[PDB]
Amino acid sequence: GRDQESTGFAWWAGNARLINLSGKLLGAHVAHAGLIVFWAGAMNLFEVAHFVPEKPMYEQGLILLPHLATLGYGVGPGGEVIDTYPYFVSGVLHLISSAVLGFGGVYHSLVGPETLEESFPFFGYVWKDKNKMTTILGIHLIVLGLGAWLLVWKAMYFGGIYDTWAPGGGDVRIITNPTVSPGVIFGYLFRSPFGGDGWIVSVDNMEDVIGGHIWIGTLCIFGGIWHILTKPWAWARRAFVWSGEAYLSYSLGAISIMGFTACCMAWFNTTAYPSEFYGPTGPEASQSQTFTFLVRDQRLGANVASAQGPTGLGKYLMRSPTGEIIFGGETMRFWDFRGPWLEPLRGPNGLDLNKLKNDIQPWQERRAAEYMTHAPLGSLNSVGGVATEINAVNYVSPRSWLATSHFCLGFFFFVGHLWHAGRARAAAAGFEKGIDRDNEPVLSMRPLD
Amino acid sequence: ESTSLWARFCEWVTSTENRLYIGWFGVLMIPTLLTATSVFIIAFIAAPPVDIDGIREPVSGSLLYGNNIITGAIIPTSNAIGLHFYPIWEAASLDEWLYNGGPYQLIVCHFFLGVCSYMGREWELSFRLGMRPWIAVAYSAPVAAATAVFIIYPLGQGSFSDGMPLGISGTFNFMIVFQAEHNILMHPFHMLGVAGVFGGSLFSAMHGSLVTSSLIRETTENESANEGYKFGQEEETYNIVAAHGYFGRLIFQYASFNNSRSLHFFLAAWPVVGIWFTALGISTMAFNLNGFNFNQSVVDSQGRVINTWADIINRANLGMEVMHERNAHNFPLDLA
């Protein structure tokens, strides 16, 4: 290693001593990737070993297994786990590959070449060499595009992916006609983030997901090819700071945005995050509660359409601010919800009174009751229910865990982007270690008013 | 000598000779903040009642409608609207716009953009003056707290009506309803935030008293020591060694700070981390991850329940829960 004597960086900032050491930096990155794969495999093995078939996935605190279920692995019609062997296979493969990755990282960090700019010119680089950095960026863009295309191939030729909107209940479908319309793809991208619109979180069928992935794979491959063959222009050289910490800050900001988007998608989406494996969402539980109370009160001989509440608005059915027929109560704020068990009862102008008066199905009622009781509310020590409940239920929704953790991560990485962007801009200018007593900039300016 | 129109405009915008720095972040900051300020003042003085719960029960919050400074507020947007975008041009008339709670959304959006631009402008002036750019990182804690109470909590609860009102009694109502629904007092992140503010006050008083106690004599007894300090002077005006000796005899030698830079970094770091954690706690509780629930935890041999201070707190929460909205509920569970 090194020391503060010959570096100027303390032990709590020791990873900054390998900014200009290409081999050791590569070793550190490979070791970290091995750590990530190790966690994936170990967590998959931990979750597969603690899974019982008498309870749904969201009732047992699983977050990695529902990811494999949505890919159509070991699941059946209706969203019931049938086989649990592919999860074991995936976990074993990840855990074993982590060993190779960790060995590579340890080798490159301990006994590998310290600075690979003289023995391996192809892999060597300088942070200020724009062409080499752009070439590396293009290579990794090509790799990511290949990964997106690999995801696309699964839904088409290798058995497909789980579709929660499939006719006759959710099942593993095959996507034959993806939506590759420019108007459809641009509609999701340049949509408002507010209610009703929802930006890209509002994607409501797997055809749109597969079409967007085709688009993103093609774009990434083309951009990688473009960057391999070119170098930044004058307007780009005039606008950016060119150093390793600057590149790190850019990446930190990008992945902070990604983390916030992931949190929102986990909280709100139902297509890519089926409720069969993640439980009901926020609005879904409220809509289910109103639906089941309407059904129960209708079974007791009541007129749900003409029933009037304490405020005079409607106990079960009211009108949305645009005219659509929606559920009444405080769930009037969640009328944008759209779920597979509720859509069949919805007509062109909202809920159909005759359909919910004569054509409500027992499976719909069971889904509504289950999503009502398993609402995404809980406590830090995993106690289900509102904050004024008793210790009877040990449950916290998998959506809550992912949403909270990823919001925290996104905020902290935004703060990291701020820190590193500021430090890079200051260090490149040349005053990151303090002000110069001999030449203080403020002393040379005219005093203010 | 600048000649182009754009070159002259850039030189003026990025000028360090202005009385108040403009910058490129100030270009975004000034109009949004002015818009929010104007709408806030006009609504606080003369706005009509706003239907906040969507149950056709308007709530008054304006001075002209029988309120004082303590009672006045800006009522959040209607519950019927939800998270929908409600700009001024989406209303049939200004009378309808003021009845549903448009000004709250307008002010909230403009204020969020303005505070983000304010932090950016802090960085910008730090760069232009030749400083180190982390006063902006310090400001990120109050920025995150404001974002959490104004944006993230409505985002997770599905409506802007669950947002914090722009008033005093409205703030107290927000706090009480938050306690009744999430048990915020039992949240470790709220405990960390309380520790942060209490420690910030402790250390501010401690540092101020220690510096004021070691002033070197440069005046007489008929004038203040502030007259003993001269602006722009080069020599230090107090005895760091004397203050360190006093503190190290007060507790013990290796508890005080012999390094002024390290002491000031600790002063900066404590409250910032505390507020970061409390804002993270609010944002986490937005997605319904409440605090510790030690209700009916102590049980005797025959199975009966032995109560605790946690159970008394639960009784208070039950008291303030069944009354936070009297007529807005038709079903037993407050799932939102």
């Binding site: 005093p447 203010l448 008013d449 | 009385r19 003085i45 001075l63 002209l64 004082n68 400074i69 001269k230 602006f231 722009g232 002077q233």
Partner: peptide
């Protein structure tokens, strides 16, 4: 009647803030 007093108090506070910002005693380097 009291609304006038409230508005006068707020306006006076804002005016004091404006005057403090734009009519301060300028610091001078010794």
């Amino acid at each position: 009647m009291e609304a006038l007093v409230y508005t006068f108090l707020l306006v006076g506070t804002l005016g004091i803030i404006f005057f403090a910002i734009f009519f301060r005693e300028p610091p001078r380097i010794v």
